[PDB]
Symmetry: C3
């Protein structure tokens, strides 16, 4: 417990900068059915379920656009990966490997990965020798469709977001600035004056480099973080396998009457598949909108609310791509070594009451100082860090101390 | 009407601090039915309505958590109830009465209170000698279930919120500070400099004490405010009585055919009850979310929007518990004695144009001053409350006045 | 592309003020049917569709209130239309024409205007000699009902909003101020110091007058902007004509059996009309809520988000009425002539590190200055625009330059 005090104030004298990951899926496997295998205005039965599959397939492109296609203007490649001591080598993409993903992005696409249909349709669809129709024939009607924005296009949106978050700050307003100077403005957004960063820059950079190194150390070796994306791929691949099991094994299970039971059994199996696809879309839409609002709040700016864009007070955020999802590298500030100091509302000198121009009056026991409330940086009391108004008699809790005029 | 002026500005020279109540219900009576009185995978008829009763019963715990369980960290008991002259004796709980509710909270639980089922099931459920099953037998199937968070647990959440709002300010950022100093920051959040509070502290405290006294004076003697909570308890107790009337009197009203009309009549009566319970939940969910967002906006911080967290410009807010609801004690600031003063954009001296470092230039008719725009606190024009830029010729509306250098 | 730099910062040295239009429909034609032509507790068939028509008719009054009836307090007529050089003659209403609409509002009601039922029912309803019932008889049952707030009442709400946005600023807080001084506060809200406006006031006013003149020049001559309101009137008038075509021509198309096909055909035609009226309400509700939130964000204040209240950084907004809609005259600021200057974190003098009290250190190549980051307004480095803390050794990127003490 931290209890009352009419005499004291708590101020932190240390801090630490932490980088933490948040994993959010935004997309889902776009499934479509060619009902001719199940001027063609409409079939009566298979069309009603396939129009819904088309509806959610368009929603996946809508979700991916709403999370990644939030900005377009190109900040050109950074590309040096040093930025005043902050090691961004884990985060910027390189042409040294022709995929041009970041080293962390490559790990996301390694751990989140695929006797199943998402495998079999791809093994069927050779970029040449195969087409949509020939494999809708070779495999009875079920298809997975191309994404509007592929992994590399999503990676280019991530690259532009990274360059725009490092070379400048997304709002305010917004114009290009050096990086440690930008984080000094992030400090001023927290409530800590800018000078606190420039004089701790190597320590802040070392804390950042340690946290960013342990992120990549954790992703592969401690896999318990990547589960949220393993689910969306595996459980939908399972959905396609469970459908095809009933559509392939139940050919020798379940004339006109026997046929009208078997085919309607296939339609009942399709209804079983479609209804849970439409239910999985309820999670994907919610998590995609969460990723979109955290893109606007954490990456495209600096958030006012706490524990939303990572734990602690928000500093900034960086995006990284993943199969059907995005990872937010939330950089946050948290104070440490809080300590109680005796405080006063005003300082009395020569019969006049002085108030801090910004900050608080605090004492080490023997002398009084003026200090910013959000970090212990004490200063002598002067005529240019205080302002005068009123009398030493009208104030409750006023205390006597000398005030200097340099 | 207040009309145009290119020459003048309106500034208030007085203010008053008001405390006002907002009453919001957040919970509803959790009803459940044991269908055996109406490996047991499912009954066909009574199960479908009882699963919905279970669904809204879980929603009541969800609503109560969303409004009260918004924070957990304990600020220990205050417990002195003086805080620089502001009398919080009406608001803090005491162990002098073993319920440990606040004196106002005890009045809320007095006026909002209960030949009816919410009474009869409780008179049936003795803490010993009775159980759930024996009274589901003694009274045909209808039950009201325990809340996840009882009145005392809700009171402990209120106690922690009060201690966290008095001992510190919930964001920014957030750390413990003396109370009148915290309200000085609330003044600076309004737009009035902090010194205006410390020199009016006894007057502000007296206004607060008068308003907080009239709140408790009003609740019991002028009951027209408590109606919003009387409704949610009485109209749901009426719903249970109206159900049981048809389930008990219509035993001698409405063989296999006569039975299949009577029992389905009981199910039709249950549908009548369940559908309006699910409609009452529409009000309870909306008001609980309103209480949750006003907990985050009014209690867990200071609101930027006006007339939301009480009438006038928002200062702070304090929670108090009530049967199935929460009361917000909105403390707000409103300016008074607005007055028009002649104003100028810049002051010309020695051929240079000076602008106020913050505030406006105003004149009493004979001399020019610099003043904060949000409260009339005039000051002499100096070189440290103005900044220089430009010429006396390029400015429209510029005026001549001396500027001093102390 | 704009690429990296650890050494430089981009600052704009020019700007331009633009006025742009956003058009939003908020209302829809309130249709009602007297089912006696198609103690009267209910008819079975026509009542179910007419209760829905009543439901959306009440929603149109709700939408119009939510967008226009957001404030009530009267700022009296301005009425001079000069406001420091900004020509508001296009925007304020005049009694020189007895409608008392603004010259732009009169153009909105000219271009958005009406062998059709919205015409025929009005030609039927003479203010005298006709009534609701006699024309529900002369034309079989279909009616369009009066709006709760007419065009002139909506115009009075617009007039009060204009007076409240010009004579004062709607929050903060809010009190009456001269107009160019208010826009100086709008500049400070953008991030540009107030003095930048007063010394460019004639240029800013000329840019405003040119944009506001081209708005009215565009509306009538280049009609491609007014289409969003042409649709909501014409396509609903078409809906009433398409209904009446089936209700009037199909009297000689489609005894008890032939009657029970014909009348149900009229009900099927009514279902065709009602379902698309309820679908058009989905657009009208969304656009009305967009107009309501942009009334609160753009007119009743100044928006923090970009490209929402017009393109560029938001300055202010003015409302104008239109048939079933509102037009927002978004005034926005956008910087121009961005230029790169060499920058430094701190300035070293006499062994002490100095930081800018607000702004950045920049150099013309030969000398160092301090400047606000959001507009190029350079200043000499002094002891009253910098503050001292730390040493010249602990800072990365520090540079040497003299600092003056006036």
């Amino acid at each position: 417990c931290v209890a009352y005090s009419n005499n004291s104030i708590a101020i932190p004298t240390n801090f630490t900068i932490s980088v933490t990951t948040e994993i959010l899926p935004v997309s889902m496997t776009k499934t479509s059915v060619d009902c001719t295998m199940y001027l063609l205005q409409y079939g009566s039965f298979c069309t009603q379920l396939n129009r819904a599959l088309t509806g959610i397939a368009v929603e996946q492109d809508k979700n991916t656009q709403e999370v990644f296609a939030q900005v377009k203007q190109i900040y050109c490649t950074p590309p040096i990966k040093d930025f005043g001591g902050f090691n961004f080598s884990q985060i910027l993409p390189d042409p040294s490997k022709p995929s041009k993903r970041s080293p962390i992005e490559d790990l996301l696409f390694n751990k989140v990965t695929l006797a199943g249909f998402i495998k079999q349709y791809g093994d069927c669809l050779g970029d040449i020798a195969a087409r949509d129709l020939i494999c809708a024939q070779k495999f009875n009607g079920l298809t997975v469709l191309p994404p509007l924005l592929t992994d590399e296009m999503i990676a280019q949106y991530t690259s532009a977001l990274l360059a725009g978050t490092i070379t400048s700050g997304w709002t305010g307003p917004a114009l290009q600035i050096p990086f440690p100077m930008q984080m000094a403005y992030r400090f001023n957004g927290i409530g800590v004056t800018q000078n606190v960063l420039y004089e701790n820059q190597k320590l802040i950079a070392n804390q950042f480099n340690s946290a960013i190194g342990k992120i990549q150390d954790s992703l592969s070796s401690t896999p318990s973080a990547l589960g949220k994306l393993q689910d969306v791929v595996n459980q939908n691949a399972e959905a396609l396998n469970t459908l095809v099991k009933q559509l392939s094994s139940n050919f020798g299970a379940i004339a006109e009457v026997q046929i009208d039971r078997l085919i309607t059994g296939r339609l009942q199996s399709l209804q079983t598949y479609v209804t849970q696809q439409l239910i999985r879309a309820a999670e994907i839409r919610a998590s995609a909108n969460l990723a979109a609002t955290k893109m606007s709040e954490c990456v495209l700016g600096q958030s006012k609310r706490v524990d939303f864009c990572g734990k602690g007070y928000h500093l900034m955020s960086f995006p990284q791509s993943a199969p059907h999802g995005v990872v937010f590298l939330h950089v946050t500030y948290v104070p440490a070594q809080e300590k109680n100091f005796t405080t006063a509302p005003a300082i009395c000198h020569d019969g006049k009451a002085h108030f801090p121009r910004e900050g608080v009056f605090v004492s080490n026991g023997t002398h009084w100082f003026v200090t910013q409330r959000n970090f212990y940086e004490p200063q002598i009391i002067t005529t240019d860090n205080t302002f005068v108004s009123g009398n030493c008699d009208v104030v409750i809790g006023i205390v006597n101390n000398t005030v200097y005029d340099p």
